[PDB]
Design a protein around this motif. Structure first.
Motif, PDB file in Angstrom:
ATOM      1  N   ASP A 177       0.815  -1.118   0.045  1.00  0.00           N
ATOM      2  CA  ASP A 177      -0.026   0.008  -0.120  1.00  0.00           C
ATOM      3  C   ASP A 177       0.792   1.319  -0.032  1.00  0.00           C
ATOM      4  OD1 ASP A 177      -1.877   1.837  -0.061  1.00  0.00           O
ATOM      5  OD2 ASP A 177      -3.157   0.730   1.763  1.00  0.00           O
TER       6      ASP A 177
ATOM      7  N   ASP B 105      -0.243   3.903   0.729  1.00  0.00           N
ATOM      8  CA  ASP B 105      -0.558   4.952   1.923  1.00  0.00           C
ATOM      9  C   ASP B 105       0.588   4.985   2.987  1.00  0.00           C
ATOM     10  OD1 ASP B 105      -3.266   6.042   2.032  1.00  0.00           O
ATOM     11  OD2 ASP B 105      -4.049   3.971   1.595  1.00  0.00           O
TER      12      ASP B 105
ATOM     13  N   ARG C 156      -1.583  -3.815   1.718  1.00  0.00           N
ATOM     14  CA  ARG C 156      -2.818  -3.366   2.122  1.00  0.00           C
ATOM     15  C   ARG C 156      -3.803  -4.459   2.915  1.00  0.00           C
ATOM     16  NH1 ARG C 156      -3.382   0.384  -1.728  1.00  0.00           N
ATOM     17  NH2 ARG C 156      -2.228  -0.088  -3.766  1.00  0.00           N
TER      18      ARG C 156
ATOM     19  N   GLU D 148      -9.116  11.583  -5.754  1.00  0.00           N
ATOM     20  CA  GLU D 148      -8.830  10.700  -4.700  1.00  0.00           C
ATOM     21  C   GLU D 148     -10.140   9.993  -4.054  1.00  0.00           C
ATOM     22  OE1 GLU D 148      -5.518  10.721  -4.303  1.00  0.00           O
ATOM     23  OE2 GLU D 148      -5.612  12.334  -5.664  1.00  0.00           O
TER      24      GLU D 148
ATOM     25  N   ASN E 260      -8.924   3.621   3.873  1.00  0.00           N
ATOM     26  CA  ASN E 260      -8.203   4.121   2.915  1.00  0.00           C
ATOM     27  C   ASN E 260      -7.331   3.020   2.230  1.00  0.00           C
ATOM     28  OD1 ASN E 260      -8.539   7.220   3.446  1.00  0.00           O
ATOM     29  ND2 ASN E 260      -8.349   6.204   5.521  1.00  0.00           N
ATOM     30  N   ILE E 261      -7.334   2.943   0.989  1.00  0.00           N
ATOM     31  CA  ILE E 261      -6.770   2.038   0.105  1.00  0.00           C
ATOM     32  C   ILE E 261      -6.026   2.905  -1.091  1.00  0.00           C
ATOM     33  CG2 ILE E 261      -6.535   0.026  -1.617  1.00  0.00           C
ATOM     34  CD1 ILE E 261      -6.611  -0.695   1.365  1.00  0.00           C
ATOM     35  N   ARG E 262      -4.867   3.160  -0.932  1.00  0.00           N
ATOM     36  CA  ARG E 262      -4.252   4.322  -2.011  1.00  0.00           C
ATOM     37  C   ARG E 262      -3.770   3.540  -3.177  1.00  0.00           C
ATOM     38  NH1 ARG E 262       0.739   8.175  -0.926  1.00  0.00           N
ATOM     39  NH2 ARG E 262       0.918   7.967  -2.845  1.00  0.00           N
ATOM     40  N   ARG E 263      -4.492   3.433  -4.254  1.00  0.00           N
ATOM     41  CA  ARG E 263      -4.317   2.409  -5.309  1.00  0.00           C
ATOM     42  C   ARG E 263      -3.605   3.401  -6.392  1.00  0.00           C
ATOM     43  NH1 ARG E 263      -9.611   1.022  -4.933  1.00  0.00           N
ATOM     44  NH2 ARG E 263     -10.075   2.553  -6.665  1.00  0.00           N
ATOM     45  N   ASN E 264      -2.840   2.705  -7.363  1.00  0.00           N
ATOM     46  CA  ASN E 264      -2.002   3.160  -8.502  1.00  0.00           C
ATOM     47  C   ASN E 264      -2.867   3.233  -9.913  1.00  0.00           C
ATOM     48  OD1 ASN E 264       0.045   1.620  -6.440  1.00  0.00           O
ATOM     49  ND2 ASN E 264       0.422   3.777  -6.908  1.00  0.00           N
TER      50      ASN E 264
ATOM     51  N   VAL F  26      -4.258   4.867 -13.756  1.00  0.00           N
ATOM     52  CA  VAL F  26      -3.849   5.611 -14.898  1.00  0.00           C
ATOM     53  C   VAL F  26      -4.393   6.904 -15.120  1.00  0.00           C
ATOM     54  CG1 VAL F  26      -5.593   4.665 -16.845  1.00  0.00           C
ATOM     55  CG2 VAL F  26      -3.054   5.118 -17.423  1.00  0.00           C
TER      56      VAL F  26
ATOM     57  N   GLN G  75      -0.876   7.160 -11.667  1.00  0.00           N
ATOM     58  CA  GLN G  75      -1.616   8.032 -10.925  1.00  0.00           C
ATOM     59  C   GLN G  75      -1.833   7.296  -9.408  1.00  0.00           C
ATOM     60  OE1 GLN G  75      -1.445  11.118 -13.214  1.00  0.00           O
ATOM     61  NE2 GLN G  75      -2.901  11.297 -11.321  1.00  0.00           N
ATOM     62  N   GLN G  76      -1.498   7.878  -8.424  1.00  0.00           N
ATOM     63  CA  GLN G  76      -1.592   7.255  -6.973  1.00  0.00           C
ATOM     64  C   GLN G  76      -2.837   7.733  -6.715  1.00  0.00           C
ATOM     65  OE1 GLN G  76       2.035   5.837  -5.366  1.00  0.00           O
ATOM     66  NE2 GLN G  76       3.017   7.850  -5.598  1.00  0.00           N
ATOM     67  N   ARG G  77      -4.086   7.627  -7.216  1.00  0.00           N
ATOM     68  CA  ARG G  77      -5.438   7.909  -6.747  1.00  0.00           C
ATOM     69  C   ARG G  77      -5.651   7.242  -5.557  1.00  0.00           C
ATOM     70  NH1 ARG G  77      -9.510   7.871 -11.913  1.00  0.00           N
ATOM     71  NH2 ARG G  77     -10.656   8.422  -9.909  1.00  0.00           N
ATOM     72  N   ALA G  78      -5.910   8.038  -4.373  1.00  0.00           N
ATOM     73  CA  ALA G  78      -6.368   7.324  -3.174  1.00  0.00           C
ATOM     74  C   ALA G  78      -7.866   6.865  -3.233  1.00  0.00           C
ATOM     75  CB  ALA G  78      -6.327   8.437  -1.891  1.00  0.00           C
TER      76      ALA G  78
ATOM     77  N   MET H 222     -10.741   6.051  -0.360  1.00  0.00           N
ATOM     78  CA  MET H 222     -11.406   5.618   0.817  1.00  0.00           C
ATOM     79  C   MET H 222     -12.552   4.962   0.812  1.00  0.00           C
ATOM     80  SD  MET H 222     -12.748   8.566   3.631  1.00  0.00           S
ATOM     81  CE  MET H 222     -11.225   9.529   4.147  1.00  0.00           C
ATOM     82  N   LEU H 223     -12.255   3.527   0.956  1.00  0.00           N
ATOM     83  CA  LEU H 223     -13.104   2.535   0.454  1.00  0.00           C
ATOM     84  C   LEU H 223     -13.854   2.326   1.861  1.00  0.00           C
ATOM     85  CD1 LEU H 223     -10.767   0.087  -1.462  1.00  0.00           C
ATOM     86  CD2 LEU H 223     -12.296   2.076  -2.413  1.00  0.00           C
TER      87      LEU H 223
END
Lengths: 582, 264, 205, 124, 283, 283
Positions: free
Chosen positions: B22, B24, B30, C21, C63-67, C69, C87-90, C92-93
């Motif tokens: 992660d 984060d 994660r 995000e 919060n799961i910061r995914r990567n 495009v 793109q490190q788009r967060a 907040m799941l």
DNA sequence: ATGAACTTCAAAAAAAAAA
């Protein structure tokens, strides 16, 4: 509720006189200022910095909000009267000419059109004649403190005419009306509906204003701007149809809370906090408060601020909620505002992680103990560092333990290993390392990272029936008997045996059990030795055989049982009461 | 295009390595912030599928589009061409900027965030380097070192789910050959997509639920509960496949469904 | 009306404001619920309309910061190369969510010949009871499914019993009336939550 | 908390030393230096040198007791312990070194009880 | 460039010392918390291979990645000023520089390195990718704390007596770290990983535990190396069962293990004779 | 600088005393918990070699690393004020200082030392790297507790006239600590480890148990020293089987061992005659 | 006519110790 809460408390701060923007303004940190008279002529380049140890860019002046330039032809944008040092004097430090010359050329045109749209001011005419002289602007470069402005990049230069003290040129009575009209005329002729924050009418605000206090530079919150980030063909801004009377409001709110007392870091994350819609206040309390009770945003935030600070200060107490406190946990990525925490609940539900962390850290304490009931986090980590709380690992210790404690996450094994090393290195387990191991074990049991063992309690667990906990109690009672034998002890059995007692039990306890009867015979009180022998029998009864080596969790259990027994023996009337019940 | 609905229960684990760290808090996997189970994003499995297809095919009508720079280095007309001459377009979907519904291609294959069965243990395995990169502020006169950090996982059978629908295959061109290639990927993509951080990963059970009807006469939750993945009896903590008990239940689906055991 | 229960592990009702995000919405988006109902069954004759959302699981942010495009595909660039468009788009799941969306459907202008309401109602009932769907429902994002189960009344417990917190204006359903077949240009009409007493209702256009 | 069927040499050795210390303590309450204050220092390492004098002094310690049935019960439990002790070893292993003290304190706890030793002796 | 797939089962143990120790743990080797099996990272084996190459080569076209005094930015800038200085249009210039470094460096050719600093030149996916080792029997940590009769810096406690600085030096009695690893061919064809480089890597993996030694790691040796040579670039059978065929469990009625006389490496090559090969280099 | 690889099999026992005792556990020697084999760290042998050099040299270019009052920072500062005071550009200045210390010091040349304190000067990898010793037969701990008729401090003194301070002085009856060690050549070429230094190190390893003696250690002697001299800098055969060829097990029907008349050092030099040599210095 | 590259936007943050 993410941005609605921002507009809701901006409407409260703007009505409670808290010093905030008023339709088209922004508390922008302007470093060096420019002083003129009524027809130009540069006077002095005064600086309003000198604040923190890191010299910021001056004081946050209530100047008009930036229109958000950013682009290859960023010169065509240009703000009102405050801008850049290349926008005013056409001087660039690392940008070169032409690129910065067009900036000043467009700033001159903007000032001229503002003067034409607002004449008879004795303030805009001075800055109009000062930008159209090509002489006084060069004299600004030869000022007494111009060398300091060229060092710090991004020196925003604002004009301030004479005979006005602290009143800026853009802060005049006429320029304020011009700014209020600009946000109501050129900003009121965009897309129609429909707003997302307020949800009423208002024109859709394209190009959201920047928010300072997050990433490397002021960056907008809701800022979609890519070929794949657009929604249903909205193409930037329109994907989140938000009005100006909400976009500007929440951006100014973020800019004001990220530069005052509301800005505080949780765990490597700068989070702004502000009170929610307070209660209407009952009569017996509002009768003594004249006003009466004004719904101030940055008022009751001190409770949650102290709580997040008491976690590092040890002054934590179980709080009664019923007072909702907003907590927007923004975090800096590359240049986008990453929201990590958002809880509308009160401080009671916001402090559940701290409560669980301190209950798992609840250890035995004797009478008149210098260590408080709740230990500060830096003071707790000081038992794991080399000597002073500074040599800790800034990635898994002072950078991850705080995040795991403030969010009720799982504690890493690094805590186990560091506490073990500092327990068998310092040759003593003071208040700080055993409580941390107890918290780790409890959180590992609660998170499935620990199976055969069980959660620990506050007091001494006389049962447990584990191969490491009873061994820790054994070492503790052994050291207690040795201390009762020799009062002035220098090289105790602890300082010579705990290095391997936590690891290899059959080597240390193979000789400690030999040294023990001599310590019992050395005791002047034979009844005390009798009670200690009975309690060590009760301790070793749960151990069917001394193991070859104590695993990583077994050493933590050893330390926990050691502290538990060494504090149960140093209690008022505990060992005697236990021995009398046999 | 195919004509059946495929809702598989993908099972993949991690022996020793970082499955899906992660960003984060750096690179830790994660994990669930409440139960401790690892949550591997389905986008990682989709990227692994893309990488396997890029390695195996290496020809037309089976490209990736969403490819890598270090691994390999009217309106409906363009959409149909992209569906024909690409594999990822028919697989997980596409987004032609000059498309229909705001330029969208949903695609049949819909994966699921891989949730681990048992709570995994984020092993903060920091690993140092004896050579710095750029001119660090601390790289003085002595040994130019930089402290590293590569989290690892002892074990964690992540549970991935998929939902292949022939309805979207009729528009994206996902034929039976593409489906067989997707299965061969999900079976053999963990033997080629390896590195020093990901470690050793393998495919466990590719229990595909082939439905006779194009709509799928079976609910997702029921098909997932029919593949019970739990811990063994005498096993205190899972460490390999001999520690799990993937007991399949193929007793109530013998009317029209087909439990294709393509992995385990 | 149909009381279809939507359940799942994680969710991502990405707000229109925080798309860079992916901060999920507090509850399931009414537009997302309508999209779920359409993915279960839809036709150029049936027009789904969400009536009421009843929450069955507490709001839990994860919060799961995914990567991701950040550049779309087209006929121009034949490739993407995510190493240049990362793109490190967060995100907040929403961990552990469950909603029973009470909703019905009407009829469009292009209903055709088979415009029977009872026929489509029975088809949707069969598809929800057996487990059939044109597309797997998504909890705000297709990376998360929906363990759907058609309920006749109430077969689960709800945490929001008393008066809870209002979530303000949420995205009801984008306006696609001005759009040609296969939507392109649209608007964004939204609505208030009123009050999340136990089961929030929607305001139909 | 005592395993009498462990079949471990250290266990029975420790139990024997424990009952010996109990007998010496029961012989006279005003005892200053017991056997544990001198014999236990090498009991788990050189048992063949200490347990010989221990068994030599055991009958005199039993005769010193004011009650003769107590000595009978103590000898009975001594033999019940030594049942699994087929021979006195030269030196105990580390595991046996720990099992020595384990059985010692286990037997001491089992002996210093209200109704336990007599209850076990009654079923014999 | 190689064309076959190799699934080697590296097996190595440790006599007495600290093999792959954890900095985030003080000075103890990586062990499984829930069980107790020792773990060894692949970077240790990679550095042992690099040291073996540095001591058994000393030539060009096989760079060894220098130690301590080797700035990566300086090496990248030196490799950039060769054939593609500027006249290559950035994009394919990075690929050309990456290919030149692969043909020049051996560490980036076998494994990989970060070449995306200042002057970017792409990145290497890497063909051979080892995994983290893991033992079978739950090993125990000995922790052999030793002393020193000489203080280092001006310590606040170093008074007038014996200037001593003790500490700990952890040791391990045994633990056959069952290492794993897979070798690809697509990335090997791009990086230029020929069969000679593969043979050199095998020789390094075999004879790295005889030269790369220290006082902390003690004595380490490699047991066996069973390489599973395939026939093509496709996937025949899952590698899980392939690596499970060479199981290593306990012998007879024993609690722990001390040397090779206590382990029973069950090698039953029966079902792997379809389209695969088998060779023994270390064992 | 040496060019051959040496795999010596150091064998040494202890008559009666505490050889390599563990500060982690009071005053007992390091023993295997699961079995019972005695363990001896290599730092004890290194300090014995240092003492032998200090008593059989007294000259320059072979520093012996002083005891107690020898502050490492002071020695580093003294070695820095020589040929590379400042005019060397920090980077290569550290390497020059390291080479000067290697040419001046013998402990850092044979083994190594930490020279990264205040004035950093790099670090020495070290050619000769001994390992931790380990016996074969499970030894037993005697624990010979002895007394003293004189108290130390007056506080711990008894309230009477009988001032005694007992304690324990652990002893070991036997235990041939089968030590191991390997010598490299690449680091020896950089540190300047010539053949004369190697011969001096061999003589020290042979005759260190005759001078370095005390009351706690008692009487210790070195059995044999079988050095496996190679032919080149490459790796011929794994060192595991090489060290396993000289096995040391029990003799006839005996339970333990008391002296050399109870051990049977099986030396069968048959398969090590390929490209390797053999010499006997201690045995 | 429109998507990846380019060129510009500001020049961060610090207390986390205490009864």
């Amino acid at each position: 509720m993410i941005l609605h809460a921002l507009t809701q408390y901006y409407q409260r701060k703007a009505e409670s006189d808290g010093g905030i923007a008023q339709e088209g303004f922004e508390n922008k940190e302007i470093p060096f200022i420019i002083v003129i008279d009524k027809q130009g002529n540069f006077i002095q380049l005064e600086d309003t910095r000198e604040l923190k140890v890191k010299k910021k860019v001056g004081r946050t002046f209530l100047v008009p909000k930036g229109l958000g330039r950013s682009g290859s032809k960023s010169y065509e944008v240009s703000n009102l009267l405050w801008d850049h040092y290349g926008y005013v004097l056409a001087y660039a430090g690392e940008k070169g000419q032409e690129q910065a010359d067009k900036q000043h050329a467009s700033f001159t045109a903007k000032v001229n059109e503002l003067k034409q749209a607002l004449p008879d001011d004795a303030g805009v005419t001075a800055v109009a004649a000062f930008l159209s002289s090509a002489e006084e602007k060069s004299k600004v470069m030869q000022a007494a403190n111009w060398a300091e402005c060229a060092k710090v990049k991004g020196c925003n230069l604002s004009f301030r005419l004479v005979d006005e003290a602290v009143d800026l040129v853009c802060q005049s009575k006429a320029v304020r009306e011009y700014v209020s009209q600009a946000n109501q005329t050129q900003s009121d002729n965009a897309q129609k509906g429909i707003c997302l924050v307020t949800g009423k009418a208002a024109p859709i605000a394209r190009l959201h204003n920047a928010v300072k206090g997050v990433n490397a530079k002021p960056a907008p919150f809701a800022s979609v701007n890519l070929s794949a980030f657009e929604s249903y063909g909205k193409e930037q801004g329109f994907a989140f149809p938000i009005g100006e009377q909400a976009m500007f409001e929440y951006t100014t709110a973020l800019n004001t809370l990220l530069a005052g007392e509301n800005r505080f870091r949780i765990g490597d994350v700068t989070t702004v906090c502000w009170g929610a819609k307070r209660t209407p206040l009952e009569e017996s309390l509002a009768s003594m408060i004249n006003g009466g009770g004004k719904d101030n945003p940055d008022a009751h935030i001190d409770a949650v601020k102290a709580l997040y600070k008491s976690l590092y200060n040890g002054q934590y107490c179980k709080p009664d909620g019923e007072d909702k406190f907003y907590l927007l946990g923004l975090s800096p990525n590359s240049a986008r505002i990453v929201v990590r925490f958002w809880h509308e609940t009160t401080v009671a539900a916001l402090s559940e992680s701290i409560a669980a962390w301190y209950d798992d850290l609840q250890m035995v304490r004797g009478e008149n103990s210098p260590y408080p009931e709740y230990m500060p986090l830096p003071r707790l980590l000081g038992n794991l560092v080399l000597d002073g709380k500074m040599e800790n690992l800034p990635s898994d210790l002072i950078a991850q333990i705080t995040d795991a404690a403030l969010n009720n996450r799982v504690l890493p094994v690094s805590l186990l290993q560091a506490a073990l090393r500092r327990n068998k290195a310092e040759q003593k387990i003071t208040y700080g390392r055993a409580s941390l191991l107890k918290a780790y074990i409890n959180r590992a049991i609660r998170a499935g990272r620990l199976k055969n063992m069980k959660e620990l309690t506050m007091g001494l667990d006389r049962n447990r029936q584990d191969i490491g906990y009873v061994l820790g109690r054994l070492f503790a009672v052994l050291e207690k008997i040795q201390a009762e034998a020799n009062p002035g002890l220098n090289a105790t059995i602890a300082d010579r045996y705990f290095g391997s007692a936590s690891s290899t039990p059959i080597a240390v306890f193979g000789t400690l059990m030999r040294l023990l009867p001599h310590h019992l015979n050395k005791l002047e009180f034979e009844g005390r030795a009798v009670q200690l022998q009975w309690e060590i029998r009760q301790i070793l009864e749960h151990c069917q055989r001394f193991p070859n080596h104590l695993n990583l969790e077994q050493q933590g259990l050893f330390a926990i049982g050691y502290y538990h027994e060494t504090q149960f023996l140093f209690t008022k009337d505990a060992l005697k009461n236990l021995f009398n019940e046999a | 295009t195919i004509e059946k609905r495929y809702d598989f229960v993908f099972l993949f684990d991690v022996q020793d390595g970082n499955p899906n760290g992660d960003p984060d808090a750096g690179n830790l996997p994660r994990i669930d912030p409440q139960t401790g189970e690892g949550l591997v994003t389905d986008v990682c499995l989709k990227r692994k599928v893309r990488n396997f297809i890029q390695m195996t095919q290496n020809d037309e009508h089976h490209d990736i589009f969403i490819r890598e720079k270090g691994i390999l280095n009217k309106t409906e007309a363009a959409r149909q061409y992209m569906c024909s001459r690409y594999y990822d377009i028919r697989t997980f979907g596409a987004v032609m900027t000059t498309g229909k519904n705001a330029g969208q291609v949903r695609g049949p294959v819909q994966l699921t965030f891989s949730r681990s069965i048992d709570p995994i243990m984020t092993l903060e395995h920091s690993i140092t380097r004896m050579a710095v990169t750029n001119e660090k502020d601390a790289s003085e006169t002595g040994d130019n070192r930089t402290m590293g950090r590569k989290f690892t996982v002892p074990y964690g059978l992540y549970r991935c789910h998929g939902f292949i629908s022939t309805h979207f295959a009729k528009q994206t061109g996902f034929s039976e050959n593409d489906l067989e290639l997707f299965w061969q990927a999900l079976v053999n993509m963990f033997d080629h997509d390896h590195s020093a951080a990901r470690g050793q990963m393998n495919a466990r059970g590719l229990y595909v639920f082939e439905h006779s009807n194009n709509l799928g006469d079976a609910p997702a939750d029921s098909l997932f509960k029919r593949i019970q993945v739990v811990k063994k009896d005498g096993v205190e903590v899972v460490r390999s496949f001999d520690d799990y008990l993937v007991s399949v239940d193929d007793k109530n689906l013998e009317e029209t469904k087909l439990l294709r055991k393509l992995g385990g | 009306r149909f009381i279809l229960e939507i359940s799942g592990d994680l969710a991502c009702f990405t707000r229109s404001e925080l798309k860079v995000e992916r901060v999920s919405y507090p509850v399931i988006t009414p537009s997302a619920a309508r999209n779920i109902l359409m993915a279960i069954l839809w036709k150029p004759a049936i027009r789904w309309k969400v009536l009421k959302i009843e929450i069955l699981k507490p709001i839990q942010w994860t919060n799961i910061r995914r990567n991701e495009v950040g550049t779309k595909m087209s006929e121009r660039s034949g490739s993407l190369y995510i190493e240049d468009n990362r793109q490190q788009r967060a995100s907040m799941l929403l961990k552990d969510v469950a909603y029973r969306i009470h909703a019905d459907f009407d009829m469009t202008s292009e209903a055709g010949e088979s415009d029977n309401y009872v026929k489509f109602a029975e088809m949707f009932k069969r598809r929800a009871k057996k487990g059939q769907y044109f597309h797997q429902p998504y909890l705000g994002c297709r990376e998360f499914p929906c363990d759907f189960r058609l309920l006749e009344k109430a077969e689960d417990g709800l945490p929001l019993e008393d008066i809870t917190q209002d979530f303000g204006f949420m995205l009801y359903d984008m306006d696609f009336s001005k759009s040609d077949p296969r939507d392109s240009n649209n608007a964004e009409p939204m609505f208030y939550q009123c009050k999340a007493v136990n089961g929030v209702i929607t305001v139909p256009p | 908390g005592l395993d009498r069927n462990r079949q471990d040499i250290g266990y029975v050795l420790g139990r024997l030393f424990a009952v010996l210390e109990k007998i010496q303590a029961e012989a006279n309450p005003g005892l200053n230096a017991t056997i544990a204050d001198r014999y236990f220092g090498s009991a788990s390492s050189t048992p063949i040198a200490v347990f010989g004098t221990l068994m030599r002094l055991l009958p005199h310690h039993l005769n010193k007791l004011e009650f003769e049935g107590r000595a009978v019960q103590l000898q009975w439990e001594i033999r019940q312990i030594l049942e699994h002790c087929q021979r006195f070893p030269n030196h105990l292993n580390l595991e046996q070194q720990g099992l020595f003290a384990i059985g010692y304190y286990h037997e001491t706890q089992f002996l210093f009880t209200k109704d336990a030793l007599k209850n076990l002796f009654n079923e014999a």
